[PDB]
Amino acid sequence: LNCLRLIRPEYAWIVQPVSGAVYERPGASPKRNYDGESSAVPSSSQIEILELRDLEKEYVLA
């Protein structure tokens, strides 16, 4: 939030990252999680950009 509300409005958005692609203990199996189990995934073929207001709402949640 700070890093970006620093910036002029041209860079005021960020793409939502792609889901997955994380594991622990480098050099291990490609998938490792502590909070697992799932039934669907957010759309990653169509990406989304994240803006001040969105980020404000997420912060409010946090």
């Binding site: 480098p26 050099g27 291990a28 199996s29 490609p30």
Partner: protein, 81 residues
């Protein structure tokens, strides 16, 4: 490892027999297989890079196997002393 040890042993194989059969017949020189395994091990591990599970799996396999031969030799010796 069997074929590498055969190369290092320069012993012939009849067609009626096989490579493993000949190696297992003259049990006096089976020790070549361990260092053949080891040589193949560094050969592969030089190539192995990060995000590799075989990187540890190969070592697991060889560890189990060698421990097992030592195990069986020890128990036979102790039982048949």
């Amino acid at each position: 490892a069997i074929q590498l040890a055969l190369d290092k042993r320069m012993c012939t194989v009849p067609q009626n027999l096989t490579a493993a059969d000949v190696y297992f017949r003259e049990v006096s020189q089976m020790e070549i297989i361990f260092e053949c395994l080891v040589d193949k091990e560094e050969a592969d591990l030089e190539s192995t890079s990060i995000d590799s599970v075989e990187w540890a799996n190969i070592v697991v396999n060889v560890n189990t196997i060698l421990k097992d031969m030592l195990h069986v030799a020890c128990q036979y010796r102790q039982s048949k002393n």
